[PDB]
Amino acid sequence: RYHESVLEIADIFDQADFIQTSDAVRQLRALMPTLSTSQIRHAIERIAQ
Amino acid sequence: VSGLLMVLFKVMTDNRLVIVGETTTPMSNTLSTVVNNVLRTTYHNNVGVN
Amino acid sequence: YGAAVVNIDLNRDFFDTATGIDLTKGIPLVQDLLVPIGVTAGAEQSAEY
Amino acid sequence: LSDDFKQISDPKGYLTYSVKYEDQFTKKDKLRASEADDRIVGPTVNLFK
Amino acid sequence: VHMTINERAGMSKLVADNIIASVIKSNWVVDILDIEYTAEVMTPSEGYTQHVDAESIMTAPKGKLFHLQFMDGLLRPEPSAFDPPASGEDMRLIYPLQP
């Protein structure tokens, strides 16, 4: 009996200075397949390209 | 007996040292969940049988 | 008059092929970013989304 | 100082499966699923066809 | 039966064909969840340019992106009163699970 859900850091910290993103990045990451480090390097080299 | 001797000899002199060969690192979504549970990131392109 | 449907798409003119994006379907799609290593990525792979 | 070892990439074992097929029930034609899985489970599937 | 197929990956051609035959003859509903697709919404005058046989939906590799088309037939005008009757029946197999 529980409810898993994203909780943005901003709802915890009152200091806006150290909070750049939100739940959206987590959701977008959830869309990504788990990547081996070489796949990460490949992504970065591709974006660089 | 001679054959067992030669087998044993060929093992006693197996000085092979494995280097990683060609190795696929498949996208996770492309695999059936039963294979994904078994696979640990990369695997050799020459998978054997099991 | 006669407009059967009016959709809201990402602007293909802005998210150009120069960004690597293709938008001919419903969704953005970028080839060769998230890929398998050691094999060519399959065509029309979902990860492209 | 020594040629102690023989570097090799895709080691072969001392044992291996050997399979006799009953030709009446076997199809000689190769089986396959999706390329992604066939690259892995493939040689197994064909052996124990 | 309301059958759910979370993953087609091991399925034989025989079984898939049998499942489709059950969909047609025994009136099964089969939700295939493994499928991912883009979905063009066609308008009646442009028809369905692309086609997907049941086999290909049942055997396409996991992780490939299907491109289904769906008619918005709301802009189909009424038939003439004197158009000949259709003795037959247009049928449909594929439907979305989500809007």
From Swiss-Prot, chain B:
Subcellular compartments: Virion
Tell me its family.
Belongs to the turreted BTV-fold inner capsid family.
The record's note on quaternary structure and interaction partners says: Homodecamer; each decamer is made up of two conformers of VP2, called VP2A and VP2B. 12 homodecamers assemble to form an icosahedral capsid.
The UniProt function text for this chain reads: Inner capsid protein that self-assembles to form an icosahedral capsid with a T=2 symmetry, which consists of 120 copies of VP2, with channels at each of its five-fold vertices. This capsid constitutes the innermost concentric layer of the viral mature particle.
Q: Please give the name of this protein.
A: Inner capsid protein VP1
The organism named in the record is Bombyx mori cytoplasmic polyhedrosis virus
